[PDB]
Enzyme design. Sequence first.
Site, PDB file in Angstrom:
ATOM      1  N   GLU B  49     -26.395  40.567  42.454  1.00 55.00           N
ATOM      2  CA  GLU B  49     -25.417  40.262  43.483  1.00 55.00           C
ATOM      3  C   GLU B  49     -25.514  41.464  44.399  1.00 55.00           C
ATOM      4  OE1 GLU B  49     -21.164  40.331  42.931  1.00 55.00           O
ATOM      5  OE2 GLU B  49     -20.943  38.578  44.230  1.00 55.00           O
ATOM      6  N   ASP B  60     -12.514  44.635  49.560  1.00 54.26           N
ATOM      7  CA  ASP B  60     -13.171  45.493  48.568  1.00 54.26           C
ATOM      8  C   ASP B  60     -12.376  46.752  48.242  1.00 54.26           C
ATOM      9  OD1 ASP B  60     -15.653  44.146  47.801  1.00 54.26           O
ATOM     10  OD2 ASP B  60     -16.321  44.510  49.862  1.00 54.26           O
ATOM     11  N   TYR B 175     -17.436  32.181  40.552  1.00 57.57           N
ATOM     12  CA  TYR B 175     -17.024  33.572  40.463  1.00 57.57           C
ATOM     13  C   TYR B 175     -15.594  33.665  39.964  1.00 57.57           C
ATOM     14  CZ  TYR B 175     -17.220  38.526  41.361  1.00 57.57           C
ATOM     15  OH  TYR B 175     -17.283  39.887  41.208  1.00 57.57           O
TER      16      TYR B 175
END
Lengths: 395, 255
Positions: B49, B60, B175
């Site tokens: 990834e 993030d 995910y």
Amino acid sequence: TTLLNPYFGEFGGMYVPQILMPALNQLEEAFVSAQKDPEFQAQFADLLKNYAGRPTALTKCQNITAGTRTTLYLKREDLLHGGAHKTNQVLGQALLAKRMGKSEIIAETGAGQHGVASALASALLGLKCRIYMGAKDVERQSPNVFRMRLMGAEVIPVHSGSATLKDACNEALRDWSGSYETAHYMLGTAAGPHPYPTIVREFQRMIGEETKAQILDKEGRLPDAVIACVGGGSNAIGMFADFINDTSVGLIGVEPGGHGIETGEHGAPLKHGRVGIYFGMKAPMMQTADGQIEESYSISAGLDFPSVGPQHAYLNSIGRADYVSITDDEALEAFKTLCRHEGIIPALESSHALAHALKMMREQPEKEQLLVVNLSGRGDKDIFTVHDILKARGE
Amino acid sequence: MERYENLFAQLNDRREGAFVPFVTLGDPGIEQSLKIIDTLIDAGADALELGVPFSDPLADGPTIQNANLRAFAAGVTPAQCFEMLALIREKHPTIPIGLLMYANLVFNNGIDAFYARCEQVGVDSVLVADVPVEESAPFRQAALRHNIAPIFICPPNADDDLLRQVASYGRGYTYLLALPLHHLIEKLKEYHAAPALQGFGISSPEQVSAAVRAGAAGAISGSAIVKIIEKNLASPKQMLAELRSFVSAMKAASR
Ligand code: NA
């Protein structure tokens, strides 16, 4: 699935990580219910009037228009508690947070005005307030930081990225993703993901509503144009909203031109940026050729937003509103002129709108026109900035 | 997306889970990043990834934010990221490669054009961090037209309707980022969702085994890998050593 349309034409949306969606949906639902609750409306109006100082005056300029056929009025948001129009909506979002049973407020700030505004609403309504701020803005705004601490707000400095606003704004959203069940994120402008652009407009619309009734009472007619600066777009959309269906009234938004559009150092993404996706919305923004978000520039810290509320991009696209820019120098001159002829020290942000009005007046002095400028705030906060410049020029 | 199908088919025949490490392309430098990737692979990673540096990663944590800064200082650009991907694919033909993108990078030169470019260099899937399923239409549509698997995140606060949509629109793998874990995996299998990979704080060997044992097809190490890079910035030789060591252990645990 939403109750209201998250787009204005092709601008807007909810471009946020999946984890934040429940939060935006809960908020939108509470806003709709609140809009329909007379008791909510009654409470909000009570604070605006008895705490904030509304309605604000609609002042007719006495000297500044001499020798022209222009009549200029200023909607006095500078007289609102806090010194700027930001107060209206923080109070509204604060109430909505309480209606949702939330007990904490999260916000971030750059110039520091939204920080101060969020803190005062929270202190008043008994909400716990925490404000993320980029260290580089902190050191540059010690006075506002202190105000925030006096009001009981916790100022969390962020030692990340460019140690600027964008990092704080990302830390603000991260915090919210884990604490939305008990905390409300008080976005400071008419931008970001739905339903913020809508909510902020509605909690600022009284600006225009009052102005209309006030100009009709004083002049018996609608103005030819209403002018306002645009950083994120809240004070402007607040003024415009009630006039949109009145097509004979021109709507003019003023973005900061900085050192000049051609220099590349400005803050006019609406007219000189490119459509992109950021801040949870699809809107015009200042970005590189490869899509990185650039920094905008302006002498006024409060217009330093590198994008713009989606509703403004839409109004422009369909031709209902016109947008122009005004440079630092032009704003500086309008700032000096208002102090000298009217005895009002306006915020440098507001000075951009005034400069454009002065421009309309001086370029065609025999043109009969009735103009209204939204004086979004007072400029006591800008005294030192203006002083340093005029000295660096020997004035 | 075929690479993902073939990977999981194989992993099933070996009663083994997938171990997928994440890294920011170009961190801390183009050539170093390429050696790191070759190391991760040689050390046993089943897939990759890879993040493309963005100015404002609103989704993030700080560990990734710094990696992104490091890549920018190295003067890394999206264009340079695509030349790297081509090289990685030219060297490792069967390994599935997934990208972690931010909407603006994909939107910039046209959504369709971005996915066409991914198909060209050999990318297998794309996860756009700030595009929820509600706004995913033009993205998943372009992805499918260019044989790219659109990956979606299934958050902790997921409801039944969200599960249905994810299972329906996603390809490659799901995910996995309250609700009982195994319950969540049960429902996804029920709606026929792509194989789920656990990507929440996977930083130890026991966590990988625990993920597999719960019915997940494997696990993704979100920042644990980025941490070793930051720790050893000054010692490139040792950095690779701790990477090899770590990955090797994480993968042994997937058996
Ligand atoms: Na702006």
